[model samples]
Target chain A: KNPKSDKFKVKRFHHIEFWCGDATNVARRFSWGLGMRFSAKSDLSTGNMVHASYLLTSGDLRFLFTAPYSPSLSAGEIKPTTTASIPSFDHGSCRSFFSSHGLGVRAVAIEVEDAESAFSISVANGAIPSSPPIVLNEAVTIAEVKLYGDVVLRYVSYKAEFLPGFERVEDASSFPLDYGIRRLDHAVGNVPELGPALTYVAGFTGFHQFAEFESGLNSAVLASNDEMVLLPINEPVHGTKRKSQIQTYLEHNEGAGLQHLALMSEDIFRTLREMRKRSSIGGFDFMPSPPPTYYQNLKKRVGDVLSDDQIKECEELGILVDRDDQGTLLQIFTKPLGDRPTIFIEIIQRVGCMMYQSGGCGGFGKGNFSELFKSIEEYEK
Target chain B: KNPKSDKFKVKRFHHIEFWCGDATNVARRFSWGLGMRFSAKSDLSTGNMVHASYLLTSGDLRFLFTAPYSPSLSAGEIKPTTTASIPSFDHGSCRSFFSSHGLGVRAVAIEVEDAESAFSISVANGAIPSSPPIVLNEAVTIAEVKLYGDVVLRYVSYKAEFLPGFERVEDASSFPLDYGIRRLDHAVGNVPELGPALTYVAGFTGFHQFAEFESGLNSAVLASNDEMVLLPINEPVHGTKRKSQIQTYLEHNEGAGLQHLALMSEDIFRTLREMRKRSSIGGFDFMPSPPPTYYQNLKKRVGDVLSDDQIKECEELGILVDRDDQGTLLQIFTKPLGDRPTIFIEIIQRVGCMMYQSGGCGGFGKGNFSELFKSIEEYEK
Candidate 1:
């Protein structure tokens, strides 16, 4: 038995960042589509000329998007079209990450009690440093360590007036709409080979296996000591009649990378109904319906955890349900955020979240993995 | 004086194709924002794994967005997670163009009477060939010739029930909502050196000089024999205390390329008002307002062509007004379509169209260029 390490204290998910082709538009996808409000920004407008960055939030979710001004768009892209004093530097990391991943999550952040201490502990605990400890605006401190693939885990010292460099936007419409989504449930990463990242990340953060399954690749979930943050890493199950879904993600992502976000909603039926309305007006484009049998048998699988009427509603909305000894989960997915089938989102509602340790209390959609993978494979086709 | 060459029969623009990073989202900026409907789509869903293409239309407007399957996305991006026999091609044009100029116009397609004859004439007229005669789905013919800066003038034989390989989408909401916007007024191309592309393009298409100005840049306009199609090419005016707007476009675009599309509206007040609503809902982001004196002096400048109340409405919406001997123009420009200060769209209303040749008859925003450049430069800052 492996004893859990407790070098530093962890709080919860601070934020997730996407290295994008266009931060403005990608932020639009979340801000308008999911009803997240624009929070803060760092870009030319805010004196950060290196890249255009936007922070969006609603409830407990914080998603950041940063698009590097490319070499072609930089020169000359920013050079004295008017001034001579605009600072310039080599934007290799931002450029290269976008080139390789095309708007995939570059950082999965953790809220830590002490950022420097977390970085120190993580580095001492067999994790590669992506960035050293950095203090921002004398208010926020952040440190990064490689978690898996092109992604890093950013340890954010708890100070949330705003991030270090970001300037808060004062748009009158910045108030977030209640889209029913409240917080994140978990995030999954897909790797060509999973065990190395799973073990390596576990080694640094002291996270342990919260759940395990073999439905959609070799799945394993890891959680923080408080169980506030959960990460599930997946690898391809070889020798299937069809190409494995996890391997296809690796291929499209060019390597291992953060795959999908599962967002928690209090009332999923209302949330999804509103999200579908947003989809009508350039909001979120969700995945298609699962096979009829998936929903037909869902009542038998989930039993009294969900009403028969609720199961019928799930069938209408294409939502799938799974139940455990403690809680029930109702979930549906989105189409890829972009044109490529790389990173996406999952809308999930835990029926009895209050009864357990929050985050991934219902474990995950293990029972529905076959239907999830099946729908995604059909989408890929 | 040069005589107009009439080697080919030129109709209006069939469609303008944007080589995008994500067509699905960018198209959302138009379809939902501008009330254009999703007309047809070509992508993995339709077996075009090499690129995902979508066609959007409203009124007489046709815009196509194609995003290439990148090498990383293509390696296993679409190599049959399900199929063993998917078609693969070297998407060099789509990939290279998007690389050189992110999310921009690769082809400004001109509807011609005969595609093959137009291609032959354009090639014989000392223009470089981008692509040769190709028949699509036995329904449409397309041929391309170099216009200027990385863009091609596609001579498309008009047969628009649907484009070649695109499959028609059957959504219930495909009917376009009237935003008071009508059709294309003109397209402008910005070049490093103006006259070469100006003359070469004019030489092949038999277009004659339609207008000239030295306000925003060294500008020259060309029109087809019927005057239904117009293209204005620009180069930096140079020697200005501030950098020329045209030169800034070139630097960000990385080369000479199509600069903007002027979409005409029947009623400027209603169109711009609805467009502003769309902007609020993620349709288009317009550039900031002009000086206070711009609206204050509008009636005096444009004379009796516009009403005192009408000018007030235009002023409220940041729409500029200009009048020539024949017609009055109410115009406003969008912020860059993407992150880079490259391509954009111009919303224009030309009053009194019965007086002369349609598209560029009102003389093309000459009076507002200084204010336009000023607002855009401020935006760049």
Candidate 2:
């Protein structure tokens, strides 16, 4: 039903999906914290292959969880190996990863309608398509995001227009409303030495480094900001050169799968509540709620620069605020999506500019630095 | 803080730990459907290792998920498996088996009060201790299950009684009283060839095959009046052999692991609601709630016999019910615990007899037949 319909469909972007080893705890964590939606189907059947799925999006994306056995798999079944058939897309490694590394299947890219097209065109240059683009009659159009480093991205379209033979959803109970896209974002990847690889991708996909977070300026943190399509292939993750995070991801694979799909939430607090509700019933593991003290501390640190309404919203919703010379970002991290420590998603709202906040004035980098300094201060003894 | 304190002053269980890979989507899917509590700590520290954890028994077991980097990983990092290392855990082949077979981390065995004795006895009997039993003074007097099949089976005496120091609890405000294991009555595993392994394990540990699902005079589908667990070992999982289900698990793992940990809920419906609340706030994913038609269909198939109260509970909670000659069992299966499709949890409460209703009748072999029949009916084209 026209994702762009004024009827408030999907409200722009919803949630994404990933496969993990064990999803029970993740579901509880995400739903409780993030307010994402979940599925009601208990029996998820895929022929002889049976697995359980947790719905993350109201209609945008559903995190499908599948395991080998009913409850748990035995030991040594999916052994970790350095020798793998990369091109083969091994499912065993994915399973073992969730089992051993506590990671999950970081696949599926669900983007807003316009963003889907833009991202697909941008990433298609050098990026291989796991699944070519295909639009459903009226349901949804989904395209698999090529795996970059350790991350995977998916582009989805919530068809706004009605297709023939498709039943029209009018009732709120039957047809939920989703908002349209407000930005063209990209999934970033960090490859330590493959600067050229990333450059090639950025160029081919029409994505560029919108911002950069280097270890030096950002205090050992790493992450790269990209344009419409996720960019800065070889950039360090965390917006800074933190070898450990990047090296760990690279040593295991070439790049990180979709670490976080950047999204813009116009109404951070209001959207967060809706997201949390959907997550509860749908079972999306979200970041832990900050301590009440964090709120008081944020005010002490930021010094009432934000609008009173915005400040109230953040405090009430437990939203974390960080800024830089460029802009202040209200952000929070979700608990690792699956049983493994693999992928995660970030819900962010950019107040003045579209840049990852680090170092400078209102950035989280400052928060990290404060903590680091505090550690050093204690070390004086 | 005591687990059994009438006040329910339970801190965190510091749950079970596991190892695996790093990915976001996969982890999210597994965590949501599995009904777990997620922690805020990210493996960002290990740079070389991605560590994710879950608090399985909110008050007892923290399942740590670990994934290490190896030259051999697949999926993430550009899918360069051909260049990866050999025997590495993250091989594509290793993960593929997980996808097809669905044997994720089956179960985890936590060390509780009885573990020291259990370990010493096992060590004395020539069983190699995976880890030496340690009596933690500051920590809870607990042991990891690491059972023959399950990943970890944690036992806590505190669940039965409150203990100081050993059970120091965090303020509910700090870590909400989301959930706890009222009791871990029993854990089950499927052994393809149970004789030698059974005898070997029984001799090593104190656990024995208390009962057999099937022995003699039993049709795979028919109910059996005579069902027994080898008295020397312990008791039958369900006096009769629901060999098919067990076989399916065995085939998936191609070996052994914890099958399922039966969590006893004093109030299944209430616990589920609490779980739902926890899912909402924590970003945990939830399994799909089946349509009303499913309940209607279940009643249509098995009426009156299941007792109105029992049927109502199953319908309300979406628990699946079946029977055998041994007795009837009310059961529900949660989504997989991880994305790899390995493990998941099962919630159960039995009455009349401690029989597994794998058949149709309340009795052993007889019960599994009916259960299988129902599954097959769902498959009929």
Candidate 3:
């Protein structure tokens, strides 16, 4: 065993923070649309006057969406009475970001044992330091690095109270149904070119390549030592007659950014079932149903691992399946997160050797590449 | 027969359009939070280039939330690529509005048999025409009049397609549960001064006073000729040591504006039950519960109207009960729509006596004013 590299060790995926124009709106959507529970709130009432942040959770997963409380002020104008507590420094960045990108990912954070070590190592290794490590009370320490486009990668220390200034929200509303999506499986980033982005990630965060491949486009999957975190990087193929989804994302998103986020699940059949329940009731639209032939092909590919009944259920629900010697995977993709066709979501379930394991790497569903490409391309058209 | 007041004839509540910085987010929340179905979309993909609008519905209730597709160009700069199809004249109003008010109701629309007549009569009666009558297509004609704050009162001709530019959105996501909210019961507006706003609404729209009263503050309930649309207007009482909720709204919202929207429901128990289900799952927080003493008083007031089990359920769910000789009503309110503590929602169920028809006035729940004021005042504290 090559003594697991001690450089920049990550404990787990910390949380994802979005700089939205309306954090409450986005948080409410996730809470209802995805079955995430609203856990906490931070605002002027809670002493975090700069911006309002909502914390939502499902299992170990956490997401924070922050929106500026008011419009940015002119240099000479007195601060508006409604947002009197907000500092000038906190007002403009998220506001300007929403102006340009609308609502999209702003930061991807990771839990680390020591944020200073994480920041110092990344910055010393040539990663641009978006913010130096700083202690926010006795509860937490934080640092940030700029990622592709305006997205930032943050590192946070574990705490008893999570964010220092947030107050626990007693949310007693019951979800319509529980979809049971557990944790983040992987987050895929779309870049202008794959090789440099892969190299930058490896050089800056010390992630090692778990797998690399190409179908219609190039992709590199990188992971942490414990394999708890995964980053799949994709770039459009140059000179291809058919435009790739990566290229479409770059144009519509205006730059490199998060392409899609995949959530892990133990029972995807139930998850997809609940999703369908949500779709018909709440107007959630998953990707258009797979062509009949795609499911026919899936049966041939995965017949040995999945039963006829299981296959029939998958086909009925439009869940995609893939298999290899190591494991079998079931997955489905949602339509774009909003109207822009930039961000989307993937739900996946993995079974390895007749048992489900959380720590095992089932790998990204490269077997479903063309199937995904076809479905997404339809949206592009 | 009192001539049925032929002066102002609005057929029904058409739709409420909110000018948000992120329409998709708000639409998504309502789609899930309120069990509203995503019905239609108008965007660059669908031919509307200036803004993206999402239409959502629950039963006969309809809501349209619009967001600018791109920031408005500076004085001489050419319009951005995404919005090249939008006229400069169409871009500034919504953009400047989102800057001033963040996210709030922009237009409260009503259906009229003749838009020209609606506009001509209203303007002739002193209504300020924010926008003169204009035909969008063969299907629709629209006009707007200035209302309290940045809100507008729109009059639209009945059409097969509500808005000409909107294309039907085939949203397929299922909601986990339906809350059974039926239609717009009433919309309350908060004003700094009472008489002028009342006179303005009366002089403009010919809404006659259905009822008027003062409890914790001054109040008046006005309605259309047929009483299909109710507007409960409130103004803060002058020189009170204890600030009224109207004053709080006036100060926080920066001027006169919509306070809360009340949704009609047939089954109060099931509606509140589903809402409770959504609250726990989607993080929806209803208005805080009243003092235990209040519920005890509620039992005394409505003991003959509601069963002990029904009253107990209302107490457990924090629903308020109001009554008069004509009918009994069940109601509950939500926390503010977002962070500003301005816009909120109320869910109401009316049980009319045999003499009081379904379409007849239930009198705006004047009996519950003190209970509502006390609960809302706690939020101000």
Candidate 4:
């Protein structure tokens, strides 16, 4: 068994659990939109406080998002708009519509040092701490971090300190068994005003800049060492002037919301390749056909940035590459998680580079707002 | 050992798959919000398609949701809002946010008599049929139906005519022998106006009324009639004035979305009872915990509407009951799915009623709106 695996680590990240309204809806959208596959099951052990879930591994990244199982945890009730109050229903429909459908940003799980410490740090960083730390058994300490007034973050501290199944386990239920948090993938945040919201988050949150891109043409280096996480905020950008999906969300979901949870992968290529050949039935899928020219073009542009082996691996694996003046990064996007144009994720690998270039491949399938919507162009069709 | 038990009468409805941007994020929200559990391994049969997922199961209900492998589905470059006039991603940033989550209302799966007929009739109902029906060997017919404007129904027709082991023969080259549409369970929907939208669906979709409840008063109906189905709509009736979950969905998810899905069952009581005893999670604690007065007063009110046997069964099974001018019914709700207050479900069993009674419980702790919110608020705090 790998030592750094769940078998040897003193305190490794296990998973992040959040409280949500719907589960199936969330899975569908993520699978279709982002390509993050479902991983674990909820055969939770005794004395556990919340549910446990995990996304398919992207490299070594495995994300866990858990939810509570008690209505006592609920914050409100969604009243559908009736014919008697059609206008109000249309206007003030609570998030139940989206939340129940398994749509909405949930929480950010960071495999960290300890439950108490993690909870403390989270609270120190604006997250509202809820629930006292609860001991699951002789080895596990689990607490919750509530953010934005109510979002919950399940912080678990195990006596065994490692991933459960990744390593050998003499006792699976105790602390130091195997579980730890790695790094942040990506967290979706909803804000009314795009510009100010993103700026505020950047300044307020400890997150710094990793890279930046714009106009599908120009670029800059807001990220100095590429050490900081990049949180890109976006408003609705119209394609063919149809009922832009953005307008629909803002109008429907009501306001700013957490959209998706993007996880980080240390080895994206390896992860994608392995997942491509999996035999599971209902899980996340990989890109059907990586762009034919992704490898050749990547070499021509960001070739020096990524190793030749890495570039070739990315091509063979069908990962997307975006590069510009600031820095270059390896990236790929998933399809819509469900059917609606709502939520999904991004699999990104930072190879000591900057910018996340679309390589002019895709960007609303159109340029800037120079022109309005041309038509309801069906890309797949 | 149980030969017949090893196989279903026919293949049950497996799940409805969707394509979104991030499956990892999607899986988390679903597992917590809806109580659905994800598989340990990703379903490779849907390779390059599924990102994340959740499974719902009752006596017969079983399903899942998935996301895509990409995110360019939005309306702008992968960048935050800037003064550069990039059209603000999805025209208000609303669509992109909501769409990225695929609105989480992935697809709806069902067990039908004829796949072709279901498709045809659904199309007649203004559904945008997806290309053609996919015939997976001889046991399953899979097709997609885009209903109304935002809803997409994934139709899975499972033929019980398959041979032994044949059910297990999944053709990875085609459809996984181990996979196909499993069985019908629950579904979700999202909308800007909860009441009107649900009412509209009552008329538009052929689904039968299940149950209904209103804010404030603690009265409701958990009705379930076989010839029809259940659709639970949500609109924040109380709590903080900030954007409710439904409103956030309207904004982030583009419009109303199929919210939480509640898997149906011939014996919900037994299943829930097992769940309560099987695990010891801390989030939601739903089972047979209705206020004593609920049973006491229920008998005094609409209790007689149900037969003595039915009452005994409900009491033994811990089912809830309520009535109004329209009629009386039985129901129950699961705990929070996640921290976002975005995903959760309601399980309902209808008796002699077609219409839902919003407030019948008089605001006690018998599954009323106030009680439900109180439960959630407890977790939120």
Candidate 5:
């Protein structure tokens, strides 16, 4: 065990940066579909001619979708349209990642007290440097390291306004009928070979394993000491007859990557109702339901915790209910983010947060994986 | 001008294909923003692992949006992710084109009685062949030639069931209220230093200039023999104080490319109402309105042709009205297709179809261009 682990001081998730094909449309989809409000923008007009980016936020959730203007060049090629004063240099990493993988989580950022120290500690602890600590206009400092496949982990300091180059947008509408999603609960990563990433994340970020489970696949949940950042990582079990969701994600996404983000809400029923309304009325896609047998079995597992009306509501809307001895979780999922069945969403509500740090009772509903697996299989079909 | 002009026989517009970053969302935008229905799709699961393509249609207007799964590979390199059977070759043209120009028209296919003859004639008459004529499943024959910077003009035989590789999608919702957008009327291309493109188009495709107009920009309308296919080409005029819209398009788009497509509708009032309803309810964007002076002057120019109620209705919805000796035309424009102000949509209703091909009447509302210029200037602001 490393004695320096306790010295790793980190706050909650700062933001998630997505490298996409069209940042504007992706931003629009998140705003219109999820009720996240547009907050800021950066592009050629703002003197950032290299790429276009939009920043959106809801509660504590911040999302940045960035799209490069051109396919990336490695070195030494004059951009056909660049002016002499603003000669373009190669910024190909995100652009190339988006080329191989579609729109995906490029970076998962964490708020830190001192970004430079955190970055140096991370690098000293076996993290591969993707970007060295760079100060942005005396207001912000940022550093990044490759976490898994094309995904990066960023340490950012809050000083200047939303990074350095961004301009804030005013007069945006709040989510019409806000669903009350308050924070990001956890992000799940699906890896073909999860051991190296799991070890690297644990060693470099000073996170510790909180829970472990094996069904069709092996999964380990990692969490920061404050219980703020939660990550449940998965890899396929050897010689499983039925392919796991992890394997499917690996195949479709073509590599190790973020599978889904779980957004925490206080009132899940209201969130589901609004999400369902938008799905039906505006044509957004929600995930398919599990078989009726799954819900029937769910009642037997959680009958002591939830009332009949609550169970009925969960069944009707295809929300899943899972309980530990200490707490319960109510959740629903969304369809894949785009054409490929790679990235998705999970809206979760964790009840009895007081017992979150005790024993193995704060685990993800391992019992629910079988039903989730079946729904995903149906999606593939 | 060319002796072999009569042999260049091509018929009506068949379809237009757009190379986009995210074909799925673009297709959704077309389906939701306009009344176009999702007709077909091709992706990895469908065995077309190279790219995701979606086909949408409204009446006779068929559109295809294609997004490549990976970045293009140049010479002397193995793709970071490529299987032995799927040796990656350079598919960089569309991706590079999209890099330089956002979602813009890539191919404008034309119906031809004999696709082979048309292909041979076009090549012999100075057109550069992008793709040679090929039969698909022994059902469809198609060929392509390079036209004005990255755009291709295709000669397609209407023999197969919607282009060979596409699988039809069923059970899609029709426009909630049919916007009544029927066929494509005309497509406009904005080219910088447009003389070569204009000369090439006229010489190679056998299209001739039918209408000419000069204002902030110089424009010449070209039409095929039956007048079923129309193209209004625009270029910057020398010594203009304010930069032309065509020049602006060229600068923003990074080169010559498509500016807009005119979708022909029958009842302008009904279509505008449905469009406005969606814009208010669904967050779709309509083009910025022209100044009030445009409407005040519109009545003076079309006083004898339109009734007061009709003029009032058009002005309220920001629709433009124009007339030639033959009859009147009602039209409205949409904002640019994506983030860039390169591509847009024009909805038009030809009040008198009988004289569509007669004299100066065979034009796309030249009188309204000034109002459009002002609106676009305001949009830039």
Candidate 6:
């Protein structure tokens, strides 16, 4: 069943990790606003001495946040996690990454058939090794390689627990709430050159171009062998009427970085309603809706991909609608998660796409960019 | 009625500023949890090019939060706010302070008789100049000097707006919520030596000792001439049975820094109730309550200064009670605002204290420190 020539097999996303100043508060924010539950932790009490990390999950999705305990330490100074002999590169990289990118994605972990095979393959394929593969007990092994700008690709082959030094959170539920958000649809990376980013990522992993979109700015969507892991790389048009949105993202982020994560929800209305309820009460805020005329002409543009009531609800909840030959996608965006307009979250629902397990084959919002910009313009005001 | 020989006079707190990774979120946290209103802002849109600052106010208490736009820029690189030649020192300091202190107070701005005179006297009295006096307009002048550790003392002689670059917030109200909080009681600074901190602050500001607490750890409460500004400096005893709480604060803070700010409320019960409600819903977690035994004997220890019904409510809300000879005080504390156990807030209500404007005469929680430690033990468990 396995190809002898293949170095490793990519499985799925293990977790998306962020480096922040306060992992506890960020975890609480995600828990309350995004309906992610705190599932595990690594900190002083857990014997990971140099930083605090919280792992959050909902359905098939996992998000991890980390904050350095010693921000004053120099960038190159990695420290021991819980012992004197073995040093943890992650302990100090939190400071350096956060110093450059503020609070944004630091690493995106992917499950693989074998960590060493993937590490060797990626490094051989010209990806810079961020860290060597290390065994986390017997059944788990992890390694890292540079992805882009300040972010890293952490490859893990695991059959057991969450991480090497994390403890399961006894009672992960604060409110025992769920908004029907399930798994990741896609992750977007903003860069100066989408062409090189596409080649670079494809060279490291066995991913190939699944689709491409050009709305002045260009985006290339790449996917793994099983099409379970999809990442889109984008670049702003060099000449534009005003500053391109992707250009603004790169400038604010200081370099190429993760711009947003699209979280797939089974029920778009339920998810948006729950999130809007929280946002109204001081949770994460949503981007403003496009003009009423945009919604009024929605079915005319998409040719009945959505119900009248669904279009009405999308207008009521500020969700966006887009369609392709494959299927239709419903999506809404949260404002930047931090003070800087660098990284945000996208809540997405797909209907009548490929019959993949996660149902993530619905196309990216190529037709909705212009209308999204109008909403952003309204938000700016 | 002004004295000819006086160089400067200290008045009250103008606003306390914190440098963080996300001022917008911090301001929202304070607004929803602490009942502060977002009242003003200085940002790129407002022509402040390098950092985004939000000003929040509740009664006489004002809190300012700022996050740098260029975290990758070097520490010495100040940038022009809206022009080329004039560099704004605050633009760069946000990164420096946040790099060293995560999310904690950077500046405690004080209303002074004259910014020039205050700057002159503070410099003459050996306080290192952080930045020279700058004229905002005909109505506002501001200057800065080193306070202690990573914090700064900002002196301002202003009759008009909140700050030089900030614009008044037109719609600050989210819910128009109030929890009866009025003004700051005292700001506590945890340092290695209380003696030197006292001498340094007193020499620069003409403040004097108003009270002292010796529970192995020593604390000196200092007050300005009008008693409107109270600051407490604390030091842990080197030789002790275990680690001193102040020692822990210093260690987690990485140096001497602000430990907590006590905000005075008119009604402790209502304020705690509102804050606790928010905490339960993921606003901010409060410190756990002391044991039932501790609360059972709280009235006996404090001599019935609290009514029987008040005592019942205190336990229910986790409010701590203490008293000085002048008056009785009720206080409750939130856990550290960030991941680090550094700066936090105390909600206090004074019963029959001084006749001063803010009524901050109710003493610091000297008697409740032991009980607070017990609650911390429970939290650790």
Which whole-number lDDT from 0 to 100 does residue B342 have in model 5?
75
Deviating ranges (above 4 Å) for candidate 4:
A1-45, A48-62, A70-105, A109-182, A199-203, A206-230, A238-255, A287-296, A305-313, A324-327, A338-340, A353-381, B1-174, B179-381
Q: Candidate 3, A177: how far from true, in Å?
A: 7.2
- List candidate 2 segments past 4 Å from native: A1-44, A48-88, A92-184, A193-198, A206-259, A273-307, A315-344, A350-381, B1-55, B58-174, B178-181, B206-243, B272-381
Best-matching candidate per TM-score: 6
Q: For candidate 2, lDDT tens digit of each residue in A1-381?
A: 111111111122233444454444454444334433344322223222234444433333344433323323223324232111111223454554454434444554434545346455655566665555554544666555455543455555665522122222223212233332133233335455455655555444433334332332211112222122233233344444444554554444444444444445556666677665545333344666655555555665556557766677776766777666666767655554543333555666665553442212133333533534444455454
Q: Candidates sorted by TM-score, descending order?
A: 6, 1, 5, 3, 2, 4
lDDT-based ranking, best first? Answer: 6, 1, 3, 5, 2, 4
Model 3 chain A scores worst on lDDT over the 10 consecutive residues at A80-89
lDDT of each: 0.75, 0.42, 0.73, 0.40, 0.71, 0.75
Put down candidate 3 lDDT per residue, B23-114, tens digits, no spaces.
87778777667777777777867756567788888877888888775433222345343332222224568766665566788888888888
* Model 2 alpha-carbon miss at residue A256, Å: 5.7
lDDT of 5 by residue, A158-256 (tens): 663576678776553233335677777788888877788789888888888774434657778777776577778888876777667777777667789
lDDT of 2 at A47: 24
Cα lDDT tens digits for candidate 6, A144-167:
888888788889897655876778
For residue A275, give model 5's deviation from the true position in Å.
3.2
Instruction: Write down the worst ten-residue block by lDDT for model 1 chain B.
Output: B80-89
Give DockQ: model 4. Answer: 0.05
lDDT of 4 by residue, A60-147 (tens): 4444433332222121334331111111111112233333333444444443347666555556655555555544435655566543
Q: Which lDDT tens digits does candidate 6 get at residues B1-381? A: 111222378777888888787676666667777777767777766765567788777888888887777644333444323321112345446666766677899888888978888999889988888888877756778888888898888888866568666788756234455788887777888999999888888787767677543355788877776666788888998777777888888877889999999888888788888887767445777886777666777767665576777788888988888777677778888888887878999888877753444335457778787766765576556
**Runs in model 6 with CA error above 4 Å?**
A1-7, A71-92, A170-173, A212-214, A301-305, A354-359, A370-381, B1-7, B71-92, B170-175, B212-216, B301-304, B354-358, B370-381
TM-score of each: 0.87, 0.56, 0.84, 0.39, 0.87, 0.90
lDDT of 4 at B41: 24
Clashing residue pairs in all predictions, respectively, total: 1, 281, 18, 232, 0, 0
DockQ of predicted model 1: 0.37
- Judged by lDDT against the true structure, how good is candidate 4? 0.40
Task: Rank by DockQ, highest first.
Answer: 6, 1, 3, 5, 2, 4
